[PDB]
Amino acid sequence: EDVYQNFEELKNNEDPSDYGVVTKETGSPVLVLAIHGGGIEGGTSEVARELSKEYSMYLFEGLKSAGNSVLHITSTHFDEPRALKMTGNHEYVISLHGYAEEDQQIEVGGTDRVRAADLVEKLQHAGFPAVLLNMDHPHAGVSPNNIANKSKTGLSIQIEMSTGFRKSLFGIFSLKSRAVTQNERFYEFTEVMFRFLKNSYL
Numbered sequence: 001e002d003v004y005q006n007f008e009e010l011k012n013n014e015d016p017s018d019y020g021v022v023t024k025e026t027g028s029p030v031l032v033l034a035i036h037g038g039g040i041e042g043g044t045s046e047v048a049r050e051l052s053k054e055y056s057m058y059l060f061e062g063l064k065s066a067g068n069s070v071l072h073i074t075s076t077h078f079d080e081p082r083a084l085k086m087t088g089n090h091e092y093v094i095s096l097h098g099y100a101e102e103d104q105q106i107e108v109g110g111t112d113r114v115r116a117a118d119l120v121e122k123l124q125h126a127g128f129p130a131v132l133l134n135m136d137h138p139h140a141g142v143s144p145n146n147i148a149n150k151s152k153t154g155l156s157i158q159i160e161m162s163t164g165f166r167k168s169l170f171g172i173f174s175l176k177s178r179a180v181t182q183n184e185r186f187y188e189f190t191e192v193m194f195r196f197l198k199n200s201y202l
């Protein structure tokens with residue numbers, strides 16, 4: 001269970017300084033979506049911001065010193081108005097998430113089954129620990145209600161990164177310091193992502 005059922009409820013309950021909505025609109029067909037940034041799923045803000053160097057981005061970030069889990073709205077309920085706008089304005093969506101696991105692992109899902117498999121292959125070739133989840137796996141990112149699918153095509157890739165994998169990319173794993181301690185692994189990973197994104201969405 002999430003604390004809030006939708007964005008309006010979160011907005012009416014939380015101080016606006018405790019969260020932030022951040023957008024970058026470039027007209028790229030692909031949108032990078034991170035609805036659980038900041039302290040909600042740590043590291044997803046930094047990955048999103050780096051990818052926004054070449055692609056449009058939507059970021060919702062939890063900015064509390066503690067307790068950011070209360071700001072998590074599951075994807076099938078996430079309706080913040082700028083997210084609805086940006087998703088509908090784009091052809092395709094890549095949606096970044098974190099989950100709790102100490103081992104390094106990347107779980108890839110979504111509605112775009114061909115591109116999801118291709119991403120997994122490209123990550124595995126590059127030495128990253130990715131697996132493809134199929135249609136019946138729980139939380140596969142396939143619901144029409146999932147924000148990531150509310151695009152012009154309906155085709156998404158869901159990237160779920162374990163705690164271990166996310167912590168491997170930063171010198172200091174904090175709200176304050178991830179953004180200024182990205183390591184060589186961070187850039188290696190984001191580069192694999194930039195190569196995939198440019199080749200897969202011509």
Ligand SMILES: [Zn+2]
Nearest residue numbers: 036041097098
């Ligand atoms: Zn998430």
